[PDB]
């Protein structure tokens, strides 16, 4: 393998705060409802939802941001240690296929009122 | 192949801006005629040019910095789609050539006043 | 070989140091001997430690962070040139063979008060 593309992505943790608060339909056309929740239960905040929100950009960069995309063919999932992971399906799939993705991999940082991700696409 | 370097520069935007307002030689030092304009023919913004400088920062990085490097042989172009590419001749392709660099990726981002780039090299 | 992980981490510089000052003991819990001086053998300042720290944490996610990792198991060293290189050793290590990792990627940025990295890990 090698690597298809590379995206990056940074949010301000404020602005996308007052951009949920303002459309209340905005939550439900990024996130899907597992990505809205804490491993708990309890719902997730503004900060860990704007990485959320960088990587998913971040994807698209790496696939070269193809008209089509949707939102919710993107998952950032949790594993037990905590480490957050991508889940392609649908139209970002279909993308991936185009390019010939099989892995990804994903880092969230939020500090300074900013939200980062980075995204590797390889095959 | 595998990665031959990976490089991340973070540039604040204002302070670009004042760099290149203070000394007009400046930006022909950094940036190709193509690169200083917009796909239309307008001129280049100045966060968008900042993120050109931080990705030209980026892969000096990658490729471990040497002395001689010109600014102007590092090349951000974009793709009809509006990906960002990097091209390299010159100075940046034979430092490229001597750690057996084969491909490039570029990301680039600007939020929050601040241009983010990240760059790998791949052979 | 192929990517095992990625982790980025972004650190605001002024916080950084605030906890350095508060705490005489914790630059010793995070860095070894070495990263605590400059190449000329003056004492290394606020923001390259941070950029360190941040490319400790990044290194850390890239191994999916697991219990039991060391700070001083990741050590930053830096090339004449000037270029940040990871050494790992012990609980690090150990880590890094249990994901198969031959190969760690390193960049560092630190401007507009915050220190970023990137961390690829590679086998
Ligand atoms: C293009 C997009 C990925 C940019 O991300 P963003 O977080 O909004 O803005 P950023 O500052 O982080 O990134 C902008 C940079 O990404 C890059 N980018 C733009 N198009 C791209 C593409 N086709 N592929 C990869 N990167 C692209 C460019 O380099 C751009 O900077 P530049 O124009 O100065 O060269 C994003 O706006 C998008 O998803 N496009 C559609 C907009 C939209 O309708 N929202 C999403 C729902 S469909
Ligand atoms: C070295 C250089 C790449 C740093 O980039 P920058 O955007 O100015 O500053 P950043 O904060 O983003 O990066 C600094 C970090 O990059 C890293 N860096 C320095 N030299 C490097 C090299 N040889 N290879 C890879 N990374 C290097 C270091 O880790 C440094 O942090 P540290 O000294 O605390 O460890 C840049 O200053 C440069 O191009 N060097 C020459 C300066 C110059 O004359 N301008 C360019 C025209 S020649
Ligand atoms: C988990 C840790 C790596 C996060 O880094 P940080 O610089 O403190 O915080 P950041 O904002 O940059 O990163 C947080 C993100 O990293 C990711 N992260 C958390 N656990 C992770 C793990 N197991 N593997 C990879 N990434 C992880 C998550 O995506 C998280 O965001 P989210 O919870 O909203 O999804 C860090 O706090 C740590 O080393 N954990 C232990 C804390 C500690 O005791 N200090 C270190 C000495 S042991
Ligand atoms: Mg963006
Ligand atoms: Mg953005
Ligand atoms: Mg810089
Ligand atoms: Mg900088
Ligand atoms: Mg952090
Ligand atoms: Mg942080
Ligand atoms: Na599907
Ligand atoms: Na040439
Ligand atoms: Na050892």
Do not use: C, Q, Y
Not at 60 to 70: E, S, V
Request: glycine share 12%; aromatic share 4%; proline share 3%.
């Amino acid at each position: 393998m090698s690597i298809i593309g590379v995206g990056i992505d940074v949010a301000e943790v404020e602005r996308f705060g007052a951009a949920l608060e303002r459309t209340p339909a905005l939550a439900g056309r990024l996130f899907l409802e597992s990505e809205l929740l804490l491993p708990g239960g309890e719902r997730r905040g503004v900060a860990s939802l704007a990485a959320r929100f960088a990587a998913k950009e971040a994807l698209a960069k790496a696939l070269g941001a193809p008209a089509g995309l949707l939102w919710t063919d993107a998952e950032v999932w949790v594993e037990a240690g905590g480490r957050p992971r991508l889940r392609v399906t649908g139209t970002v799939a279909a993308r991936a296929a185009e390019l010939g993705v099989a892995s990804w991999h994903v880092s969230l940082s939020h500090a300074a009122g900013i939200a980062s991700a980075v995204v590797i696409a390889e095959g």
